[PDB]
Design a protein around this ligand. Structure first.
Ligand SMILES: [Mg+2]
Ligand SMILES: [Mg+2]
Ligand SMILES: [Zn+2]
Ligand SMILES: [Zn+2]
Lengths: 589, 589
DNA sequence: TTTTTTTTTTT
């Protein structure tokens, strides 16, 4: 019952952070600068500053937030009166609630309490409007009266029309007045439980969440998020009894976090090592022995090149990798690692996917009867990585649907009266087997690969993996048994901080091509084209795409070391890795 | 008539277990310590203690369960006052009801009586909430009053709204108040009668059951369960009568069991015998003469290896077996035995299965038009065994759908806007015929098997069965006729005991590899690779998967004797069985 | 009719 508004104000005005800069007065300082009407407060900080204040938020959230938010509004007005007439209400979002519940473990005892759920966002609806205070007109020739229907109370989830006119006490018909009605932004989304916590032999569960006001459009499908709010039962058709007094539950979101400064200097410290590139390569799939050239190639695809956008066209900046190898060469294990270390990645298989599922699907809503688009795997992976294992098992009639997405990075649909064009700027990493399961060295490369030259030309690097039992079997066997015994390689960058390093590099580093790098690349391309003319039977063609592959690889090498430009050393590395690619496919220079 | 609360409390505190250790007193504090709020009792023990109490439970169940619930709750409160304010109600569940009725024999006379049904779980719905006590507000400008609608009575299965406001006696509008409403967990499941119970020439029948409160998520689809509770008629759509006074029936589950200390002593006693391994093998398919190497291989697949989960990857722990043989070699009979003895197994046929049915199917829900996922055979067999008879009859373009699930143990779907990943950690045992029905010795091994090298490398062991008539025909004929004469082989572990032994071993034994075993395995693997490279024509490739097969087989041998370590003896057995596999496919060693 | 994934008969 003690007044916490004074406690809140002194907590906000007077607080010391780890950096010792009064973290919580700069947030409100920027609150009036951009007028974002939302403040983020950590539960750990409020608990340390005042244990009693933190508890009251947890258990009395229903009737402490409006008072707490109202106190903050007055303080903001005192700081700057100009905030008036621009923002009427300010929301306070609390994160870091210790009450974390698994999606499958929610029971009746958790209804009405502030909890946190970690999951995957799978579906988002367009932003709509919700009525919380309506205005009605009594259509009865004596009344012609206006009144806000829900008195001293907001409109509930179910819309209700007055039965007795409050202005005259008589029944009749009432007409809604949209211009005098108060609205609020409304959005609906679906959260799916992570695959880690799904029990054996069961399908993942889903929960419906509601985003309102400034929380709308705060995430995109496929994101991993943490949501905090209050559970409640869902009402859809209360008018129709139809027996079955059984209801589903939904969650009213109060705050959302999508999965800091101490990371910046940690990343900067790593980039200062002259051997940072070797450390990153050694950290790719530590459980796999050998395959150093493949690990280097996979590292390049994670960083990628620099896309170019011009007045009349744009140039692809992503790097595509294709691996062909004998069974048991750990191709799938490395692809699994890539899907985990990448900040955004989608893992698909050749057999378990279709053309519609990879790019876009036209689906007809049975209710309304109209068609609309559904995002495919490549569209969802925009700005990230797409992994397509067992690509050779795809039907050729179905695999050609990704030809334009691989180069033009767009998806074109002309179906059922829908003409659309969606961005699909995603890198593609694929693996497969030769025509006869294992590579036959007694036959040409033409019949071993069994892939059209059109798709082969789209891959920046192609590596043919041969399982040759030689003298390295003992070393390989010892390494595998050590892995099974729990022994782990040391002096490697762990997956968590490696993910942060890639995300930072892809966002703030844009290397530039220097004059000396241009000469090395130009000379190499001329020799590459000249050497290819010797053997025209090979299904590998040296097209101008290969020249742009060298440019992209050179930029990726510079991006690994966080350099701002491409020097001759990065160009030399790009030529070296390209040489190994050519040797594998049988082109020797 | 009389109150048995004193008897019930006395029975709980005075009953004697098998060792007269009061097998019921230590359950009470376990209930208190973990706040499980659910206690189970055995009907045989209650009948053995007091005959009168057992009859009252078996007959007056609906008017004695709340009475015993209140008495037990009071005994808990005095034992520990902290139990209050955390659990407001404790349920007591009775099992072992003598009233057992087949699913097909239920008649109107059994309605309203405590019965028990044994069947197979097929469908389970997500957990929902059911209102048992509502709160309404009369929306009439004079009332604004809140009240609990169902007075001194639980809310019926049909949601009924008050017609006359009790607080004012007038009709009008009533608004539900979710905050003051009381809810209870609610789940719906479907049970099917056992295949051995279905009459000739008819489809199996199904029954709908309801699980509430702590009984939710008590089992997974495909389980064998025994459900006890009260039958009742189902009221689903009472809005419009439409004549049809006919109703279905459903069951309110009171206690559910799936599929112990005395068994543990029996299991541990068996493991003391030095020849337990040979004794177990002799118990595999006792009606089949010969095929000793096959029975040993099948025994290993039942136990499996030790899966390894690391911070960056996971390693398969299951063992896959492939059998190719001439018709009439008892391949199907042995596979049928594995289904009966395995704690969890799924039996499929190559011709009677599809790619979508094996892994996962995307289906359009008719009510809403939205696509959703359906679990396939491999997903339903997670943590168990999947049997695929007549694998050679599958279309090759359709058989490749299980390549991912057999090594990575995952199912990936990218179809119709759905991207998902599912766990399929199951062991695969497959059988089939050679290319020409019977094995042809003139032709090589490559054209006889007629399978791609990719699928062959996935199998830990491959055995080729040749039906060669010889001097052993008389022994085989005598054995078969003895089986038809009713004579049974003795000194074999019964199937029920063997199933318990395997389930215990797979849950509590995790063997570890010693230094001595590592040296033996490494030497043998190197020897395979050298020998394989000498004859680069066989359809069997010695990939690194073969090395991991040796580790998995060695762990299975140790797990078969409940050993915590993999000594050198288990390594020799693993090497020996692998030698026979190589000789079968014509690879000499 | 229309696009989609599925099992099925029949174009
Ligand atoms: Mg693979
Ligand atoms: Mg058969
Ligand atoms: Zn009026
Ligand atoms: Zn009233």
């Amino acid at each position: 019952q003690i007044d916490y508004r004074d406690v809140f104000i002194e907590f906000l005005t007077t607080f010391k952070g780890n950096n010792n800069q009064n973290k919580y007065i700069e947030r409100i300082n920027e609150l009036v600068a951009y007028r974002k009407k939302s403040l983020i407060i950590e539960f750990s900080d409020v608990l340390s500053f005042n244990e009693n204040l933190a508890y009251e938020i947890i258990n009395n959230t229903k009737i402490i937030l409006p008072i707490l938010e109202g106190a903050l509004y007055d303080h903001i007005l005192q700081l700057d009166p100009t905030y008036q007439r621009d923002i009427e209400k300010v929301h306070v979002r609390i994160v870091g609630i210790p009450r974390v519940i698994e999606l499958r473990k929610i029971r009746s005892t958790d209804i009405g309490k502030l909890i946190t759920i970690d999951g995957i966002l799978v579906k988002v609806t367009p932003v709509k409007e919700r009525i919380y205070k309506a205005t009605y007109k009594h259509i009865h020739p004596d009344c012609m009266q206006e009144f806000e229907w829900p008195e001293d109370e907001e409109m509930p989830e179910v819309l209700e029309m007055p039965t007795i006119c409050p202005k005259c006490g008589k029944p009749g018909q009432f007409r809604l007045i949209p211009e005098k009605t108060k609205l609020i932004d409304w959005q609906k989304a679906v959260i799916q439980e992570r695959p880690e916590e799904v029990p054996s032999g069961q399908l993942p569960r889903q929960l419906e969440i509601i985003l309102e006001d400034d929380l709308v459009d705060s995430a995109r499908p496929g994101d991993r998020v943490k949501v905090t709010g209050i559970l409640d039962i869902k009402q859809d058709s209360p008018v129709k009894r139809g027996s079955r007094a059984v209801f589903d539950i939904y969650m009213k979101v109060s705050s959302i976090e999508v999965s800091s400064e101490e990371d910046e200097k940690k990343i900067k410290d790593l980039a200062k090592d002259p051997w940072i590139r070797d450390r990153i390569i050694s950290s790719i799939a530590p459980s796999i022995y050998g395959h150093w050239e493949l690990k280097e190639a996979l590292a390049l695809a994670l960083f990628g090149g620099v896309p170019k956008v011009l007045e009349d066209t744009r140039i692809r900046g992503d790097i595509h990798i294709l691996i062909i190898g004998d069974p048991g060469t750990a191709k799938s294990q490395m692809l699994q690692f890539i899907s985990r270390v990448a900040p955004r990645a989608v893992y698909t298989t050749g057999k378990g996917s279709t053309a519609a599922g990879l790019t876009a699907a036209v689906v007809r809503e049975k209710g309304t009867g109209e068609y609309y688009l559904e995002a495919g795997a490549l569209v969802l992976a925009d700005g990230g990585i797409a992994v397509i294992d067992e690509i050779d098992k795809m039907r050729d009639e179905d695999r050609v649907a990704i030809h334009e997405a691989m180069e033009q990075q767009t998806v074109s649909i002309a179906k059922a009266g829908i003409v659309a064009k969606l961005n699909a700027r995603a890198a593609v990493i694929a693996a497969g087997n030769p025509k006869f399961g294992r590579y036959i060295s007694e036959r040409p490369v033409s019949d071993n690969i069994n892939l059209p030259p059109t798709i082969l030309s789209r891959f920046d690097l192609i590596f043919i993996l041969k399982d040759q039992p030689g003298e390295q079997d003992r070393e390989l066997a010892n390494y595998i048994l050590d892995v099974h015994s729990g022994k782990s390689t040391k002096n490697i960058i762990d997956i968590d901080t490696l993910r942060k390093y890639i995300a930072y590099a892809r966002k703030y580093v844009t290397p530039k091509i220097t004059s000396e790098a241009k000469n090395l690349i130009t000379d190499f391309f001329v020799e590459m084209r000249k050497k290819s003319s010797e053997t025209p039977d090979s299904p590998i063609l040296i097209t101008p795409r290969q020249l742009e592959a060298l440019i992209r690889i050179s930029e990726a090498y510079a991006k690994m070391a966080l350099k701002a430009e491409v020097t001759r050393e990065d160009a030399e590395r790009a030529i070296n890795i390209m040489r190994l690619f050519l040797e594998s496919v049988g082109v020797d220079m």
